[PDB]
Amino acid sequence: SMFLPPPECPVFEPSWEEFADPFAFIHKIRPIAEQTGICKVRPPPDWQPPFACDVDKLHFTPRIQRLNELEAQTRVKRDYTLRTFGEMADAFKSDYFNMPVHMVPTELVEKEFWRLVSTIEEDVTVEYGADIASKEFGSGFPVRDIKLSPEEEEYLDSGWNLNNMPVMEQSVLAHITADICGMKLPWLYVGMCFSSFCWHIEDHWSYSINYLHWGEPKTWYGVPGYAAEQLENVMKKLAPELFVSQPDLLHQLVTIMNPNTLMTHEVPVYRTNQCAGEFVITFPRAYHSGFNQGFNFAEAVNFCTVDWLPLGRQCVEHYRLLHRYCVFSHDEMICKMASKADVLDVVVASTVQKDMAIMIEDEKALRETVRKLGVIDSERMDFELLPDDERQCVKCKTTCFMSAISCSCKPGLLVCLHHVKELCSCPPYKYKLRYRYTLDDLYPMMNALKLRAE
Numbered sequence: 001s002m003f004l005p006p007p008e009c010p011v012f013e014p015s016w017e018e019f020a021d022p023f024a025f026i027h028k029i030r031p032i033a034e035q036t037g038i039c040k041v042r043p044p045p046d047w048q049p050p051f052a053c054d055v056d057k058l059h060f061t062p063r064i065q066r067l068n069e070l071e072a073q074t075r076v077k078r079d080y081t082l083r084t085f086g087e088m089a090d091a092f093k094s095d096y097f098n099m100p101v102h103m104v105p106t107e108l109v110e111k112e113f114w115r116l117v118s119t120i121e122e123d124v125t126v127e128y129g130a131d132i133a134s135k136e137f138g139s140g141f142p143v144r145d146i147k148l149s150p151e152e153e154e155y156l157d158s159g160w161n162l163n164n165m166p167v168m169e170q171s172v173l174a175h176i177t178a179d180i181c182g183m184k185l186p187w188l189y190v191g192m193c194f195s196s197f198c199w200h201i202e203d204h205w206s207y208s209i210n211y212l213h214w215g216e217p218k219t220w221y222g223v224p225g226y227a228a229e230q231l232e233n234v235m236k237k238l239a240p241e242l243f244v245s246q247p248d249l250l251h252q253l254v255t256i257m258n259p260n261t262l263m264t265h266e267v268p269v270y271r272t273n274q275c276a277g278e279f280v281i282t283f284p285r286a287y288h289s290g291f292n293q294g295f296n297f298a299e300a301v302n303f304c305t306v307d308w309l310p311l312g313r314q315c316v317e318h319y320r321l322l323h324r325y326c327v328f329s330h331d332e333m334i335c336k337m338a339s340k341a342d343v344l345d346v347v348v349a350s351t352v353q354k355d356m357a358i359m360i361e362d363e364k365a366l367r368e369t370v371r372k373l374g375v376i377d378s379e380r381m382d383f384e385l386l387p388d389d390e391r392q393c394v395k396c397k398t399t400c401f402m403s404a405i406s407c408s409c410k411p412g413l414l415v416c417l418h419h420v421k422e423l424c425s426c427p428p429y430k431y432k433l434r435y436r437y438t439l440d441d442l443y444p445m446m447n448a449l450k451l452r453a454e
């Protein structure tokens with residue numbers, strides 16, 4: 001009645017041995033965790049990274065948030081120090097409940113959150129911090145620079161130090177040379193009571209991993225990848241405004257929605273309270289949302305394993321159908337790795353090779369189709385040198401790399417090979433096929449991968 005908490009997600013407690021390699025571990029828990037979308041990981045008892053900072057010298061610009069179920073919010077992007085924010089956040093919670101903060105039960109804050117967001121008369125607003133690491137506000141994990149203590153040095157090269165995990169060698173997003181700050185760098189989050197993250201999935205359906213450095217807990221709701229489209233159908237019925245087309249990536253619309261509503265429509269949902277010193281991991285295409293119990297400080301980063309590669313291709317296809325902008329070119333990343341085949345991890349080499357083979361067969365079919373439409377002239381083009389906004393399909397907005405069509409009639413415009421009819425009204429013999437590689441260039445790149453993989 002009123003609120004029925006979803007069942008608890010899986011909780012893992014790896015030994016020091018299991019813990020040592022994060023990628024091996026994540027692959028091991030995958031058959032369990034991917035059925036629930038999110039999972040929690042408790043590090044071995046003596047893994048404690050040192051947290052140290054001056055609460056007076058760390059500044060950030062707060063974001064303001066209204067708390068209404070089904071109301072549209074925009075996804076990403078006055079002044080507080082960490083101390084002045086903390087004083088504001090503690091007083092807020094203390095005055096809301098007329099209690100000391102540590103006596104307010106987590107079960108009660110959860111019940112109250114879902115009451116207040118549904119009640120139109122209540123108009124509670126809260127503030128929070130969200131930003132990538134910078135000079136004015138940096139990682140909560142140790143990084144190189146300032147002389148470090150021996151304990152800080154222990155954690156400098158940990159796999160679970162979230163600065164490192166993007167650039168390790170069983171991850172596939174490391175060798176991307178393209179500028180993608182939002183996606184390879186950690187984000188820092190300063191929470192207060194009821195500050196909330198709306199329902200979403202990660203860019204390119206990647207994994208995410210979140211560490212709560214300190215403070216009061218963070219409450220999570222998660223949905224497994226296989227149920228993503230069920231959730232979206234429910235969302236579309238109850239709030240169609242969120243689904244209208246949008247001019248860019250800085251304009252994505254998201255919302256708060258009671259998990260009991262999803263469960264009523266037969267969408268599986270799980271929950272957890274993440275406490276200080278614990279990790280939460282989200283899997284590819286797993287919807288998630290939540291809210292903070294009180295003043296706290298968290299750090300999170302996207303990442304991509306060899307398991308993810310085929311889904312990454314399927315995601316870019318889904319973006320095309322939806323006319324959604326890409327953060328990077330998937331084919332470009334694949335060819336960049338093929339070109340470094342001799343220094344690749346051998347399991348990586350093997351998995352990249354399979355995706356490359358599919359890429360090449362799809363590209364063969366597409367070029368044959370546009371040839372039969374009467375496009376004859378062609379010229380090689382180094383797509384990776386063009387700014388992203390100069391190589392998007394006019395129609396579906398996909399980031400071009402393997403090929404595109406141009407016409408002298410519309411200087412600078414491109415369509416991908418799926419949308420040859422959408423460029424202009426000139427006859428196809430006036431068009432030109434721009435391509436990065438010939439078929440004959442591509443098969444040897446693939447062979448280097450096979451040899452490295454053996």
Ligand SMILES: O=C(O)c1cc2sccc2s1
Pocket residue numbers: 075076128129130189190191195196197292298
């Ligand atoms: O974990 C949090 O406190 C937040 C995650 C996100 S994503 C956008 C704003 C926020 S706040």
Ligand SMILES: O=C(O)c1cc2sccc2s1
Pocket residue numbers: 030034225283284307308310311
């Ligand atoms: O290719 C697939 O179907 C999947 C790859 C991965 S990696 C995590 C969950 C899943 S499901």
Ligand SMILES: O=C(O)c1cc2sccc2s1
Pocket residue numbers: 360361362363364365367368437438439440442
């Ligand atoms: O010139 C052609 O017909 C092709 C070139 C390339 S590159 C990948 C597939 C194909 S098919």
Ligand SMILES: [Cl-]
Pocket residue numbers: 067068069116117118119120121122123124
């Ligand atoms: Cl409200």
Ligand SMILES: [Mn+2]
Pocket residue numbers: 200201202208288
């Ligand atoms: Mn997320």
Ligand SMILES: [Zn+2]
Pocket residue numbers: 393394395396397398415416417418419
């Ligand atoms: Zn297109």
Ligand SMILES: [Zn+2]
Pocket residue numbers: 407408409410424425426430
């Ligand atoms: Zn034209």
